[PDB]
Amino acid sequence: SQRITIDPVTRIEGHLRIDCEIENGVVSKAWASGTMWRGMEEIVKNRDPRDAWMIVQRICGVCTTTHALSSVRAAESALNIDVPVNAQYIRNIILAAHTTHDHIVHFYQLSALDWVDITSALQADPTKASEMLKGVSTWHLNSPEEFTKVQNKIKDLVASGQLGIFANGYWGHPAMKLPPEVNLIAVAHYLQALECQRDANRVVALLGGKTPHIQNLAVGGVANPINLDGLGVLNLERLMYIKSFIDKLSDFVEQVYKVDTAVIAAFYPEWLTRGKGAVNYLSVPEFPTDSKNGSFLFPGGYIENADLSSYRPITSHSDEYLIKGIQESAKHSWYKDEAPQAPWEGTTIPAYDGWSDDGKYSWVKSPTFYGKTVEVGPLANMLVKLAAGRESTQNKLNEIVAIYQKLTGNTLEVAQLHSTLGRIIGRTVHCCELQDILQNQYSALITNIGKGDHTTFVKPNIPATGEFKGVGFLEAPRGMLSHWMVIKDGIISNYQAVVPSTWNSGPRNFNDDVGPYEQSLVGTPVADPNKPLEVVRTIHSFDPCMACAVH
Amino acid sequence: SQRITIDPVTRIEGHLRIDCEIENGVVSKAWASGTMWRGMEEIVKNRDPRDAWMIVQRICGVCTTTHALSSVRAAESALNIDVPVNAQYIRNIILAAHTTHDHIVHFYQLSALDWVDITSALQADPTKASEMLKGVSTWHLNSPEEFTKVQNKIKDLVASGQLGIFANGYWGHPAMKLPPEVNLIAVAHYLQALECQRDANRVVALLGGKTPHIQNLAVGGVANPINLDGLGVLNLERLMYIKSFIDKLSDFVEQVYKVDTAVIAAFYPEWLTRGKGAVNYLSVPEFPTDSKNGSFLFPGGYIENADLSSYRPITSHSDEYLIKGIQESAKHSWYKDEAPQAPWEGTTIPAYDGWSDDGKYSWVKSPTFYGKTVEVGPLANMLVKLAAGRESTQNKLNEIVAIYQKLTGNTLEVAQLHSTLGRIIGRTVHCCELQDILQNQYSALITNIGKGDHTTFVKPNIPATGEFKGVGFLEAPRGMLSHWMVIKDGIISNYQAVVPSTWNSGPRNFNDDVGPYEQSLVGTPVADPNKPLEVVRTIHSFDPCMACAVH
Amino acid sequence: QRPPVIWIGAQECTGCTESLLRATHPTVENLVLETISLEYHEVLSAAFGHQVEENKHNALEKYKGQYVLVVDGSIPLKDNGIYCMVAGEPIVDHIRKAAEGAAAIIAIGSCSAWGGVAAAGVNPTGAVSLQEVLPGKTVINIPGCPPNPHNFLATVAHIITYGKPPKLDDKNRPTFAYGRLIHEHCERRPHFDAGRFAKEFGDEGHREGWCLYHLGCKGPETYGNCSTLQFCDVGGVWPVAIGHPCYGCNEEGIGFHKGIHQLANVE
Amino acid sequence: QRPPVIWIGAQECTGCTESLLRATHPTVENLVLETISLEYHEVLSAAFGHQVEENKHNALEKYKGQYVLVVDGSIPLKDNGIYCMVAGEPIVDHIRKAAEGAAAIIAIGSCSAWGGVAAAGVNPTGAVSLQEVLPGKTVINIPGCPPNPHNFLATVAHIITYGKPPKLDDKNRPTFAYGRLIHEHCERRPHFDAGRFAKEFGDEGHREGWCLYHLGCKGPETYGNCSTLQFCDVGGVWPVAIGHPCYGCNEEGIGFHKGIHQLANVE
Ligand code: SF4
Ligand code: SF4
Ligand code: SF4
Ligand code: SF4
Ligand code: FCO
Ligand code: FCO
Ligand code: F3S
Ligand code: F3S
Ligand SMILES: [Mg+2]
Ligand SMILES: [Mg+2]
Ligand code: NI
Ligand code: NI
């Protein structure tokens, strides 16, 4: 029996502490704690509704774009503004390209080093490594020569004695199961992923004005001026440049990231039977394509007790059933008001009193949906799409399963997706489907401009009296995001963000029910309590973002 | 005998006609003809000496940069101006990076389809093609997967029925000797070459202000403002960016271009025994690194009757022996004045009278060196470096020979370099050695700026009376270039360019001696006189540039 | 099927073709494999001589009314066309023949757009523009020496995607690229306004990125997109940003006529 | 051996680290493998928890007097520093400890340079700048939200290659990046000078690329290189060029203080 603390958890965004009780070599109880707060909700209060997005985008630079888009959607909701369709195409391209960068970096830069042993890659035979991928991937950069070059980089770094950020990693740990060759393949793909993500961000930059932190939004649409014949504006040449980057993303996503995902499952199949965080899942529909903030390319919904057959679809960001269900509690958080609060009536009054196992232990609030704990993010979003019968999602999951089948002789059932690996799989499936979103929306934009529609912005009016409440939903890389704005006498009187990592990372709730991170850890085997790699494996699967969770 | 005409010769710069008499399937006599003239020498006359470089740069856009640099050197010569060493480093980087792009494009885009049969590539086994390169190259993009993708690109093009620039090629010609697999490898490399040359021109652009046609020179130095701490000028961030592209060139040059050159020689060894154009060779030293227009990184010289042991070194661009030896004749060219002319006294008086086998047949003049015909360009520059005992050149040639010997069991001797393949080899050696020039000169620049030297420009004075003469030499991608300027009463009173393809492509001279192109073709076997691929193979080895030859 | 293009070079230096090798959207490989079918281009053609001339004749027939004709270089009229002869005929005859069946006709570069450097000075060959030799035809002019290749490629793409040319100015130049004076969209305008001028290359003001008007900048009299689209897609690269004045290469009567250091007229 | 770097994040959003992932000269992979030894960075480190704090302590000792310390985010002083706690201790303490042995100290981003968004409004956590936490130390400020990553990387490179920081202004900002007002090197200055203003996004002037002053552009009161160096190295990409006014994110008292559409003071 013993108590461990993992502080800092690295290879996430932000500041997280994880505590675990270990009994008989298995985690029996866990605590998740966000250890930094800024008070972004209070910072944005009393300002013009139009200014909020530029401020609140700074909730997070990893999931840049997301809080900007949710904020303008929230003001647009309060104000009853229908966004021009060209502005929707542009917003959608940005969100899809951003999310591509985000998921690739998560799988490689943030998560791979939980599963991959770089020291072991030094023992690999590069020709055997390449030979292992024959008939498994068509990627053009899996040669023995590529792998030898990558192995020599690792050799040179080790030889210099300055391992820096690769130092004191979990090399030789008994939970490291990859052969030398597979470790080497992973490091080569880690480096290749950096090129792909850079291309995805060039898409974002050409529409956003830069990234991180785009600067092309407005309450009412976008700031991009569409004019095929204009000098210095969004013309056909600039659109062609955007397209040139969109086209560079697919091969890596399909032939490396998608395949790696199947492969890690094949080597670590025990991780399909652990890390279940919840039995309820929520996602919102995403990528609106009509003139009235609807006709989403991706579907949303709510799954209760893992029952896909009886899930509830969500087709509208104005769905009152979704809106009325959401509350947050601060019973076990460092805020004063503890009873569950609907976010339009939310407060964020700090009340730090130090850590207590049974009291307050986190700056993360505890969200519920009609009083239940819910997992959000790519596992939720994939399960909802499967529940909806979305053929694209089924088909993409089936490709990953076919690779897994070929390597293992076993198949993967939906029951096995409620797991650490299933979570990873939903993320990869989302990244793959996002490449068709990009092609679709680029084409829709070109076609619409050709019909003579260059409209991008409708100037809002904000009544100087009255109180108006708006909510902006967005399916972010880490799950359902919502910004809740109350306007009174022309200014923001309340602003509450309920962020996807709030749902997953939040501490025990008003009824002391356990959040997804904390639940997911129960039952984790921990071979060495001083080096709890297995705990970090499961926590990384949720893609924590603590600037997001706490704000 | 049979008479044939090849007009236009394609896959060159500019407008070239080649005629041949063929006796029993062997070329017995040939004629080279530049068929387009602009009169660039006259266009630039009667202007301020400072303006010449911007105008005469437009002699050619393939060898962009070269005429600009020679022109400023010529005005500097006339005025007795010593160029600041920072200006030399910058000119040097531009010329070396440009020439990298130029040579890569010549081997792949211009020349490879003489030797490579795309139809045959359709029959290749991509896996076998990849296996042929094990232990022959370490290039990372020689996988069967890369090769299959390329093969499918060819397949898709053929199946469209729109072959375009690949239509009516010499597919199945009896002089095509490569196996299917090697044809497929060459196509893959042709496409990869395009990425590498684009990176080379990014170097050129960041110093030149664009390319084609740089815009950063001046009589007196360069227009780049060196200030590590300045916004909007050549600061450390900009230098770092330059370096990032310099670093991207070497692997393709060494692992692809250098290797393909050896391999082509291995499959076509009879091409080591034909295409000798001359017995005399000339090159000028290049890449000055002192404050007095000297201390060149590459050596120059004159080889007479192929005797490397008795060659004459040229170490200065003010060498009187070099200067006084150069003349041009128009006896068989469409100009009025026919006796050999020193270029400071040159005329260019058009006198077109149509084609005559024994009379005038070209817009190219006939240059001589002390009355002899001379080949210039990479064969000349390699042979001079070998005569000088330059170890870098010796070693690089030995690397090519080692690959050739691995494939064939045979070595190459210097005698075999006086040939069509020797000329191609010389070009490749040059491209490889140029990568070290780039590293050397980037490091020299960073070091010099670090010592507190930010100087880049010496403002000239130009006497308003008097007549004075200058000559600017440059070792261009195609060979020794010289621009000859006479200034009288402050304006250009004569201007004569003697360009490398003028030496090589010029017609029979005042003594009816045959120039390099015409000489090189005697003995060429022609299997099909309707499709004289063998003639074009030899002509392309000289990298003709007719805008250059004629101006 | 891909839209066909026939490219004929007249008194060209090849810089306008070379511009395509710097392009990124599309790259030249994607241009020729995906975007268009380049039916004739002597710089890149596998075929030569009689074979490439047969290609041209076959394409001119097969694609009559459908191809874009592109010309670089000037057309020399002096002495009955003999200053540019291809396959034994004046280039002006090749161009007029090909123009007969063209769907659209583009003069890429200053030489074909207005005569350019080849028509400067005494004009040794009587070089003229493409529009001059095709009086009955609307020639789209894409000037510059050479233009940014996307000035061309996005013009072609507009024809392909939307079925007509881009909007043109009164010199038949695409407004997205030539619609504004360089000086009316130049980042050194604040310096001009303040009287902050480089006087010599390498002086203190030059080394601070000040305006290049007193070095002879022709931005005040040259239409183009050099300060915004710039060159080579690496960011920050155009002549003025590198430290050298605009020479006016886009603009008839400016580039190749005025000296580098001659002052521009300001409107 | 590569020069050591210790990066500590305080009240950061991670956007300042994420800028590195857009960098090209060097790329983040070349940064960490070739240019520096990144001895501590929580976002990329293999080690976590106890193991990573070991790495940090070892590195602070081993490289005493040699490492560059980099901080992103503001440092919250309210209530004894408990608004940012790492390994059970206030981040202000981690930062002051690491500062003791640093060869050079860099505040990357507006939050660490001057407090930024985290210190704005009522400043719920008493967030302050890195320089405020380290009164006896020279802190190099690289502001922006986030800066172009090369504003940072070329500062580090100057330290490495030439052995001293770049030249700095009176706010300790490198002059190569922050030496000039955006409006004193903005390509839309001609439009400003002529009274050619966008009045609402999507209007006719906006669609011609006119000046954004009347939309609230803060270029007249913001020092930076956003109009020249721009972002992402693709060419032509900064907020104004895309169609939106500068918000003043570089500049204390402007960004996160003034409304988007509030007008700037013009000098
Ligand atoms: S416009 Fe310039 S680059 Fe194009 S052909 Fe004429 S001289 Fe050459
Ligand atoms: S004169 Fe030239 S550098 Fe100066 S503002 Fe005008 S275009 Fe720009
Ligand atoms: S400066 Fe901006 S991008 Fe950097 S930590 Fe602060 S909010 Fe994030
Ligand atoms: S107000 Fe803004 S857009 Fe207008 S010139 Fe100044 S910095 Fe440029
Ligand atoms: N993705 C993301 Fe960030 C979190 N959690 C948001 O929203
Ligand atoms: N290289 C080149 Fe052009 C030729 N010939 C010049 O000089
Ligand atoms: S010389 Fe030409 S390339 Fe642009 S900067 Fe001036 S129009
Ligand atoms: S908002 Fe910031 S990124 Fe530059 S354009 Fe303005 S200083
Ligand atoms: Mg909240
Ligand atoms: Mg001449
Ligand atoms: Ni986030
Ligand atoms: Ni040339």
Binding residues of C for [4Fe-4S] cluster: 13, 16, 111, 145, 183, 186, 211, 217
Identify which of D157, D174, D175 has the shortest CB distance to residue B240.
D157
Residue with tokens 């409004």: D121
Identify which of B228, B237, B446 has the shortest CB distance to residue D150.
B237
Q: Is the CB of D238 under 6 A from ligand 8?
A: yes
Contact A222, A215 (CB under 8 A): no
Q: Return the ligand number nearest the Cα of B58.
A: 1
Per-residue HEC secondary structure of C149-174 comes to HHHHHHHHHHHHHHCCCCCECCCCCE
Query: Same domain, yes or no, for D98 and D118?
Result: yes
User: DSSP letters along A122-150, please?
Assistant: TT--HHHHHHHTTTT---TT--HHHHHHH
Contacts of C132 (CB under 8 A, 6+ apart): C75
CA distance B423 to B516: 12
**Minimal CA–CA distance to D237: which of D223, D226, D246?**
D226
Query: Same domain, yes or no, for D14 and D139?
Result: yes
B478 assigned to active site: yes
Residue with tokens 């010569």: B77
> What Å resolution does this PDB entry report?
1.5
User: DSSP letters along B289-308, please?
Assistant: -STTS--EEE-EEEE-TT-G
CA distance A108 to A260: 10
Q: Return the ligand number nearest the Cα of B102.
A: 6
Number of residues that this document lists for chain D: 267
Beta-bridged to residue B468, according to DSSP, are B487
Contacts of C150 (CB under 8 A, 6+ apart): A237, A240, C23, C25, C229
Residue with tokens 């076509």: B268
Q: How far apart are the CA of B139 and the nearest CA of chain D, in angstroms?
A: 20
- The verdict on a CB contact (< 8 Å) between D259 and A531 is no
Q: State the number of CA atoms in the 13 A half-sphere of B233 facing the CB.
A: 30
H helical segments located in A253-390: 258-267, 320-325, 378-387
H helical segments located in C101-238: 109-114, 130-133, 149-162, 175-178, 189-194
Q: Is the CB of C239 under 6 A from ligand 2?
A: no
Q: Is the CB of B20 under 6 A from ligand 6?
A: no
- The verdict on a CB contact (< 8 Å) between C187 and D227 is yes
Q: D160 in helix, strand or coil?
A: helix
CA distance A276 to A414: 13
Number of residues that this document lists for chain C: 267
Q: Is C261 within 8 Å of chain B by CB?
A: yes
Query: Same domain, yes or no, for C192 and C247?
Result: yes
- The verdict on a CB contact (< 8 Å) between D29 and A191 is yes
Tell me the CA distances in angstroms from B62 to B13, B256, C19, D155, one per residue in order: 7, 22, 10, 38
CA distance A413 to A419: 12
Q: Can you give the CATH number for the domain in which D254 is found?
A: 4.10.480.10
Quick one: fold of B1-551? Cytochrome-c3 Hydrogenase; chain B (1.10.645)
Residue where a domain terminates, one of D133, D156, D177: D177
- The verdict on a CB contact (< 8 Å) between A232 and D232 is no
Contact A219, A93 (CB under 8 A): no
Beta-bridged to residue A476, according to DSSP, are A479
Query: Same domain, yes or no, for D117 and D189?
Result: no
Structure token pair of residue B71? 């022109």
Beta-bridged to residue A300, according to DSSP, are A314
Q: Is C175 within 8 Å of chain A by CB?
A: yes
Query: Same domain, yes or no, for D184 and D150?
Result: no
Residue with tokens 């008994």: A174
Q: Return the ligand number nearest the Cα of C226.
A: 7
**Minimal CA–CA distance to C156: which of A416, A236, A27?**
A236
Closest chain A residue to C151, measured at CA: A237
Q: Is the CB of C189 under 6 A from ligand 2?
A: yes
- Helix pair A378-387, A391-408: axis angle to 10 deg: 110
Contact B384, B283 (CB under 8 A): yes
Query: Same domain, yes or no, for D105 and D134?
Result: yes
Q: What are phi and psi of B288, to 5 degrees?
A: -70, 145
Contact C172, C141 (CB under 8 A): yes
Q: Which of A15, A20, A63, A541 is catalytic?
A: A63
Query: Same domain, yes or no, for D164 and D186?
Result: no
Pairing of the two strands D37-40 and D67-72: unpaired
Residues of C in contact with B167 (CB under 8 A): 39, 46-47, 55
**Minimal CA–CA distance to A411: which of A421, A401, A420?**
A401
Tell me the CA distances in angstroms from A139 to A124, A247, A258, A297, A406, one per residue in order: 20, 15, 11, 29, 18
Q: Which of A332, A478, A508, A537 is catalytic?
A: A478
CA distance A538 to A515: 14
Closest protein CA for atom 4 of ligand 4: D211
Number of domains in chain D: 2
User: DSSP letters along D84-141, please?
Assistant: BEETTEEHHHHHHHHHHTEEEEEEESHHHHH-TGGGSTT-TT-EE-HHHH-TTS-EEE
- The verdict on a CB contact (< 8 Å) between D161 and B236 is yes
Contacts of A504 (CB under 8 A, 6+ apart): A277, A375, A376, A377, A478, A479, A515, A516, A517, A542, A544, A549
| Beta-carbon count within 10 A of B10 CB | 24
**Minimal CA–CA distance to D233: which of D133, D149, D132?**
D149
Closest protein CA for atom 7 of ligand 1: B58
**Minimal CA–CA distance to A509: which of A412, A388, A364?**
A364
Amino acid identity of B67?
H
Q: B19 in helix, strand or coil?
A: strand
Q: Which of B20, B60, B196, B431 is catalytic?
A: B60
| Beta-carbon count within 10 A of C50 CB | 17
- Delimit the domains of chain B by residue range: 1-551
**Across chain C, which distance is largest between two alpha carbons, in Å?**
62
Residue A281 CA from chain centroid, whole number: 15
CA-CA-CA-CA dihedral for C40, C46, C47, C53, to nearest 10: 10
Closest protein CA for atom 6 of ligand 7: C246
Closest protein CA for atom 5 of ligand 6: B501
Query: Same domain, yes or no, for D85 and D196?
Result: no
Amino acid identity of C32?
V
Contacts of C70 (CB under 8 A, 6+ apart): C5, C6, C7, C8, C105, C106, C108, C152
Structure token pair of residue A455? 């409209």
Going through B379-527 in order, the beta strands assigned E by DSSP cover 467-476, 479-488, 491-498
Q: What are phi and psi of A437, to 5 degrees?
A: -55, -45
Structure token pair of residue C216? 């002879």
Beta-bridged to residue A376, according to DSSP, are A282
**Across chain A, which distance is largest between two alpha carbons, in Å?**
72
Instruction: Give the H or E element holding residue A433.
Output: helix A420-450
Q: Is A229 within 8 Å of chain C by CB?
A: yes
Percent of residues in chain B assigned helix, strand, coil, to nearest 5: 45, 15, 40
Structure token pair of residue B361? 């047949």
Interface of chain D against chain C, CB under 8 Å?
A: 183-191, 193-194, 209, 227-230, 232-237, 241
Closest protein CA for atom 5 of ligand 4: D189
Residue where a domain terminates, one of C137, C152, C177: C177
**Minimal CA–CA distance to A290: which of A83, A72, A501?**
A83
Burial of A465 (0-12, 13-18, 19+ CB in 10 A): exposed
- Helix pair B533-541, B420-450: axis angle to 10 deg: 30
Residue B113 DSSP label: G
Burial of A122 (0-12, 13-18, 19+ CB in 10 A): middle
Residue C253 DSSP label: T
CA distance B120 to B171: 8
CA distance C50 to A209: 52
Contact D248, D222 (CB under 8 A): yes
**Minimal CA–CA distance to A375: which of A483, A313, A288, A302?**
A302
Contact D234, C235 (CB under 8 A): yes
CA-CA-CA-CA dihedral for A398, A402, A403, A407, to nearest 10: 150
Amino acid identity of A383?
L
Q: B252 in helix, strand or coil?
A: helix
**Minimal CA–CA distance to B513: which of B331, B350, B306?**
B331
Q: Is A244 within 8 Å of chain C by CB?
A: yes
- The verdict on a CB contact (< 8 Å) between C166 and A450 is no
Binding residues of B for Ni(2+): 60, 63, 545, 548
Query: Same domain, yes or no, for D60 and D186?
Result: no
**Minimal CA–CA distance to D144: which of D63, D259, D3, D255?**
D255
Based on its alpha-carbon atoms, the radius of gyration of chain B, rounded to whole angstroms, reads 23
Q: A22 in helix, strand or coil?
A: strand
CA distance C9 to D114: 59
Contacts of B146 (CB under 8 A, 6+ apart): A140, A143, B188
Q: How far apart are the CA of B275 and the nearest CA of chain A, in angstroms?
A: 37
Query: Same domain, yes or no, for C119 and C240?
Result: no
Contact D19, D146 (CB under 8 A): yes
**Minimal CA–CA distance to C44: which of C14, C12, C64?**
C14
Contact D186, C187 (CB under 8 A): yes
Structure token pair of residue B318? 């003010």
Structure token pair of residue B176? 């095509």
Tell me the CA distances in angstroms from B215 to B65, B209, B415, C182, C246, one per residue in order: 9, 6, 42, 16, 9
Contact A147, A184 (CB under 8 A): yes
Residue D256's domain comprises: 178-267
CA distance B208 to B212: 9
Q: Is B228 within 8 Å of chain D by CB?
A: yes
End-to-end CA distance of chain C: 48
Query: Same domain, yes or no, for C65 and C132?
Result: yes
Give the strands of the sheet with B312-314, arranged side by side: B281-283, B300-303, B312-314
Query: Same domain, yes or no, for C73 and C203?
Result: no
Q: Which of A475, A483, A548, A551 is catalytic?
A: A548
**Minimal CA–CA distance to C183: which of C221, C142, C219?**
C219
